[PDB]
Write a protein that binds this ligand. Structure first.
Ligand SMILES: O=C(Nc1c[nH]nc1C(=O)NC1CCNCC1)c1cc(F)cc(F)c1
Length: 280
């Protein structure tokens, strides 16, 4: 394997764009910078989680070599800064939901669903990557989070204010990505986590009472004002003329402030917006 470059580094290890010397195959090799989150789990999590919308473990040799995908969704949104075409919004989110469905069935919450970890193939096939930050639903009791700020923006209001993290928070990330794909803009951006609660409430309205109670019981937010909103702007108003109305209905169910009301994957896939997509 010759080394062709560095794909990325961050807080998860290092991914190297490498090429097999015999076969001119660009591959993405991950090694760490076992190491905090076990490559050993990942190589088995990626032994079960083999499906067309999850990254392929091509081989392993201390560590892991993946298929190389030239692009991710983060790059797409920079090149299409006002959103990708509406048909692509439905296609990518449907593929993303399918990958989450295959993760959630084996009781794996991905925990770092963001546009960087969504690769898009030359055939426009979405593939989920970076399972290092995950937790399986048994065992677990983990921290091992991605604490990057871009990751924060895809987190549930419950997780920001201190709750456990389950399948419902993975679905909240899907709704955040649906909106960003539609107009290119981060739905819930915040330099500070508290500023995010303003942006969550400015669209989805005042928070549930359980959540606003945990706010006043948490060390991280003490001493500071609550991001209160007089007159909220609904999702319907936020994406008026931008999103197909049937697709907007899926998003509303993805972004229920109370985690209990949130759609999980089977309801999302059987949602109306995918009827013709459910054939294709
Ligand atoms: O497996 C990962 N990434 C990849 C596998 N195959 N291709 C890629 C890849 O990132 N491709 C990019 C897309 C954008 N354009 C440059 C090439 C991976 C693992 C992590 F832990 C963290 C992470 F961010 C990515």
């Amino acid at each position: 394997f010759e080394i062709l470059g560095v794909v990325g580094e961050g807080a998860y290890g290092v991914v190297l764009k490498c090429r097999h010397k015999e076969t001119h195959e660009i591959v993405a090799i991950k090694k760490f910078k076992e190491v905090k989150e076990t490559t050993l789990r990942e190589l088995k999590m990626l032994r079960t989680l083999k499906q067309e919308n999850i990254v392929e473990l091509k081989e392993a040799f201390l560590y892991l070599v993946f298929e190389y995908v030239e692009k991710n969704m983060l790059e797409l949104l920079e090149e299409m800064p006002n959103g990708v075409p509406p048909e692509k919004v439905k296609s990518y989110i449907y593929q993303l939901i399918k990958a989450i469905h295959w993760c959630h069935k084996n009781d794996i919450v991905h925990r770092d669903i963001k546009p960087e970890n969504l690769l898009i193939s030359h055939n426009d096939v979405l593939k989920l990557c970076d399972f290092g930050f995950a937790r399986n639903l048994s065992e677990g009791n983990n921290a091992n989070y991605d604490e990057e700020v871009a990751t924060r923006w895809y987190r549930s209001p419950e997780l920001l204010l201190g709750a456990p993290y389950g399948k419902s928070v993975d679905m909240w990330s899907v709704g955040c990505i649906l909106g960003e794909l539609s107009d290119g803009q981060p739905l819930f951006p915040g330099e500070s986590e508290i500023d995010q609660l303003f942006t969550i409430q400015k669209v989805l309205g005042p928070l549930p009472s359980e959540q606003m109670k945990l706010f006043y019981s948490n060390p991280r937010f003490h001493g500071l004002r609550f991001p209160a909103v007089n007159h909220p702007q609904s999702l319907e108003r936020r994406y008026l003329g931008i999103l197909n109305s049937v697709l907007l209905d899926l998003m509303k169910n993805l972004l229920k402030l109370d985690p209990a009301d949130r759609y999980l994957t089977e309801q999302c896939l059987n949602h109306p917006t995918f009827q013709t997509q459910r054939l294709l």
